[PDB]
Write a protein that holds these residues in place. Structure first.
Motif, PDB file in Angstrom:
ATOM      1  N   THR A   8       0.845  -1.011   0.059  1.00  0.00           N
ATOM      2  CA  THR A   8      -0.258  -0.139   0.575  1.00  0.00           C
ATOM      3  C   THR A   8       1.241   1.057  -0.052  1.00  0.00           C
ATOM      4  N   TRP A   9      -0.096   2.287   0.188  1.00  0.00           N
ATOM      5  CA  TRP A   9       1.174   3.473   0.302  1.00  0.00           C
ATOM      6  C   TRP A   9      -0.299   4.970   0.331  1.00  0.00           C
ATOM      7  N   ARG A  10      -1.456   4.596  -0.175  1.00  0.00           N
ATOM      8  CA  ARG A  10      -2.048   6.048  -0.365  1.00  0.00           C
ATOM      9  C   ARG A  10      -2.029   7.097  -1.242  1.00  0.00           C
ATOM     10  N   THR A  11      -2.046   6.985  -1.956  1.00  0.00           N
ATOM     11  CA  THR A  11      -1.565   8.573  -3.159  1.00  0.00           C
ATOM     12  C   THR A  11      -3.123   9.564  -2.778  1.00  0.00           C
ATOM     13  N   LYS A  12      -4.154   9.292  -3.840  1.00  0.00           N
ATOM     14  CA  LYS A  12      -5.779   9.643  -2.907  1.00  0.00           C
ATOM     15  C   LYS A  12      -7.065   9.421  -2.018  1.00  0.00           C
TER      16      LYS A  12
END
Length: 14
Positions: A8-12
């Motif tokens: 994961t990382w979450r960009t938006k």
């Protein structure tokens, strides 16, 4: 968000 190589990382704001 985007998923690649089981990570994961979450960009938006899903």
């Amino acid at each position: 968000w985007k998923t690649i190589k089981g990570k994961t990382w979450r960009t938006k704001q899903c």
